[PDB]
């Protein structure tokens, strides 16, 4: 072991990891996006979508607010909060700032995305991208803002992190990316376009709220070999290309 | 009546049924899918989608669990159950096996589907098709497993039935099929591709939980002329081709 | 033990008590109750009887 | 059929019924007792015990009171009612007469009992048979009071019915009977006494509250071929001896 070109266990371990890296990056592989919403109580909502060809997530203002399963949520008062966020002084709420509003958002894409295809529609609380519909471009191409999440020299994911620290940061949010395709084969050409339509039906979604970033790292990111960047700027993920 | 080629009531009845069979199978017709989830209390959740060109359903682990409208659901404890299914020992639940988990799934397609186009993504409970995203093909083509539901010699639908009898059968699920098209006209060619995009918006969904398979047969399958295969292997549906 | 005494009872948690009483009525006589469920998950799925090694096995009666 | 000694279906039907009658009456058969408690709301509590050799039922004052499963029972006030029945002015109840007290009791034995063995301890509400323990015989032999419940000329059971129409009829109740044994073989002789001890462990009990006497007749008495005498003096049961 570990002394020649006849260490087949070694060579096969390296190929097994390389094949995983490369399959994900192939047109047969997944592209994945995650939206993390950070609340002031330290809990974090994750929404994930996994699909072939292209993938995205779209949420309303109300859907991004903290919801604690099986516990009190101040439901009636929070409905009035929403009315007062859709139009100033439009509601009868009993609070100035709802602690259910996200304080920050992180968007992470798998390393199989093409970063130049990333698009985001960060709307206002009534779901208008840019003040009034009449003047809205329906998305912004934000890939230049994405940081590489790296482990051991390898890009394991891409991150865009933004705070919503102001009372006026009340948002709706959609994001989208396309799987890398360095070929000249268009996956939406007529030969394959129905498979892309089927990919819309086949995409798998996951959502959950973790009590703490610790629990997210420990029980969501790490066990599934997902990439992550924490509030301390620490990168998580698994390097696979030409690696044992 | 019933003695010559001049029984016009007879001829028109036969044409009325044949026209229904054939319209469904035309490119102007519907293609439909149903997912049945069977619970240990004998109740059955149905999700149906009806659309032109192609159709599918995609559900999370949590969305497939039993929910009894207007009755207690052990909501807090069931949220902890989910945490303990996403990661072993990840939750603080007060039970070993949730009776809200489906014990079996049946997928049924209308007879207008092309069986060779059927695709299924049966994920794990965090919505990954095959253990880790890096090694996942995003679907399996399962049409070879579909049985013909037959009535009076006619295929009235297609069924795939699988049990989840083990403690480890904790799934997310998507399925997709394409309407038959024996022509060489591609419904997603440039001439018609925007109508396929509109079909995504126009698809109609239905979901409901029936207390018993009897109630499903009696009040959902039968009144709507839908195909079904029961736990006793009995076929239901209505034969229409060249039939009075 | 009675039929009812062998059913699952979770101390200090909800037990669907009214509906489970109707389940019993529908098990004592077919269609005798007004229950909101086909199969009660409170029914035992299996039973194991164990005796100490001091029993005489030929005396066992059920 | 119906014209000779070679109607074997006829002869076997008659033997099948006769064998049932006689097996019950054998030392290998059951002896059974039922206590019915009648409440002013028309509901009826039944307690049944079925055993070999001998059988009985013993209940406290409190255990005979009406209890409505899954509905309000005035529980705190009813506990105070009990305190005021155990000792005059001993409780702080908010009512003069609890409608949960039985208005009448009927005791029924199977026809396999020996009526001369019947014993009853009808105690006061603190479970003393006859005013003070020091002067109490622990039972009364009441068989002379039992009426034959008859169908088609056959005794199908034995009934003792008594009203508790007064404010002072607040009782505890036990009853016991021994299976008939016209032989000189004592079932409690040393050869078989351990089987009688085992019969104490093996006796099966049933209790339930029926909303109405109609429901008792229809869904408890009749389906099980049990004897009954209704408030109108009507007999129910099934005659089997030498009968088709």
UniProtKB/Swiss-Prot annotation, chains A, B, D:
Q: Is Transmembrane among this UniProt entry's keywords?
A: no
Q: Which residues are glycosylated?
A: 24, 73, 82, 233
Q: Which UniProt keywords apply?
A: Glycoprotein, Host cytoplasm, Late protein, Signal, Viral occlusion body
**Which Pfam families does the annotation name?**
Cypo_polyhedrin
GO CC aspect terms: host cell cytoplasm; viral occlusion body
Give start-end of the signal peptide: 1-23
Any idea where this protein resides? Host cytoplasm
**Taxonomic superkingdom:** Viruses
Q: Which InterPro entries match?
A: Cypo_polyhedrin_Cypovirus1
**Further remarks about this protein from its record:** The sequence of strain H is shown.
Q: What does this protein do?
A: Major component of the virus occlusion bodies, which are large proteinaceous structures (polyhedra), that protect the virus from the outside environment for extended periods until they are ingested by insect larvae.
Name of protein: Polyhedrin
What organism, scientifically named, is this protein from?
Bombyx mori cytoplasmic polyhedrosis virus
């Amino acid at each position: 072991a570990g002394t020649s070109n006849r260490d087949f266990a070694g060579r096969e371990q390296r190929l097994f990891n390389s094949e995983q890296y490369n399959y994900n990056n192939s047109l047969n592989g997944e592209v994945s996006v995650w939206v993390y919403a950070y609340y002031s109580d330290g809990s974090v909502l994750v929404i994930n979508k996994n699909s072939q060809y292209k993938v995205g997530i779209s949420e309303t203002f109300k859907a991004l607010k903290e919801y604690r399963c099986g516990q009190h949520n101040d439901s009636y008062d929070e409905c009035e909060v929403n009315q007062s966020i859709y139009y100033p002084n439009g509601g009868d709420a009993r609070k100035f700032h709802s602690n259910a509003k996200p304080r920050a958002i992180q968007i992470i894409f798998s390393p199989s995305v093409n970063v130049r295809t990333i698009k985001m529609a960060k709307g206002n609380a009534v779901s208008v991208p840019d003040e009034y519909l009449q003047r809205s471009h329906p998305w912004e191409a934000t890939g230049i803002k994405y940081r590489k999440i790296k482990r051991d020299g390898e890009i394991v994911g891409y991150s865009h992190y933004f705070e919503l620290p102001h009372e006026y940061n009340s948002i709706s949010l959609a994001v989208s990316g396309v799987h890398k395709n360095p070929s000249s084969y268009n996956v939406g050409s007529a030969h394959n376009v129905m498979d892309v339509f089927q990919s819309c039906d086949l995409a798998l979604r996951f959502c959950n709220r973790y009590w703490a970033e610790l629990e997210l790292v420990n029980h969501y990111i790490s066990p599934n070999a997902y990439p992550y960047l924490d509030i301390n700027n620490h990168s998580y993920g698994v390097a696979l290309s030409n690696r044992q």
